[PDB]
Design a protein around this ligand. Sequence first.
Ligand SMILES: *C(=O)CCCCCCCCCCCCC
Lengths: 204, 40
Amino acid sequence: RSVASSKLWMLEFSAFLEQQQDPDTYNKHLFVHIGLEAVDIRQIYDKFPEKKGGLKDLFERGPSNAFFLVKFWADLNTNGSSFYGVSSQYESPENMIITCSTKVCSFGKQVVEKVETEYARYENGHYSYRIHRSPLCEYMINFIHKLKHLPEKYMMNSVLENFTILQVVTNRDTQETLLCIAYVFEVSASEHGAQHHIYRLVKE
Amino acid sequence: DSETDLEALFNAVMNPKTANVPQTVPMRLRKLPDSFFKPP
Ligand SMILES: *C(=O)CCCCCCCCCCCCC
């Protein structure tokens, strides 16, 4: 349980492209997937939203064990019948109503936000939350298109230096930060595809 | 002033002569763990 605070654990996260060959045949490509070293949060504050409700504000409010930084190497090696989606799953000892806010940021400025409300399902003494096949926003579909249409892999990483995603999962009622995950990206060059490192975000 | 939009972002990399986006410290040059740039 890496991406886990005292109250919530993210067991699964994946962004994918699903292509319907025919009514019975679907090909799915994973861009990124999950399914601890420390990073000084001050080194990344410039890549995320500032001011009230921004990364610094959220981090200072705490709890400090809810804050993570995920470095993804994305697998972009893939080709009307397309669905771009994201799925994630969480577990808690508590039955909460949670809100998941996902902000796409460019040079630290918010470009789009998706907000999702999720309710608990009892599962073996604990509670599960699933965000199942959330459609990827048009901005992200277009961004992926533009990335793949660049001539050189080095250009893709150059673009990605200033592209980030911030995911904040909150208890809707209490506004307690259950998980806050900062995502940073490079392109995978690996024969093994998408990879990731998960870090704890610390104050210094 | 620099611009911060989607065409500008890709334009900056595709045609660096006409780039007008904020300038920043490259991630490689920051105080970050070595594993940050070595995938498993
Ligand atoms: C729009 O509504 C989507 C909000 C962001 C969803 C997060 C998906 C993570 C994107 C990873 C794809 C790889 C791109 C480099």
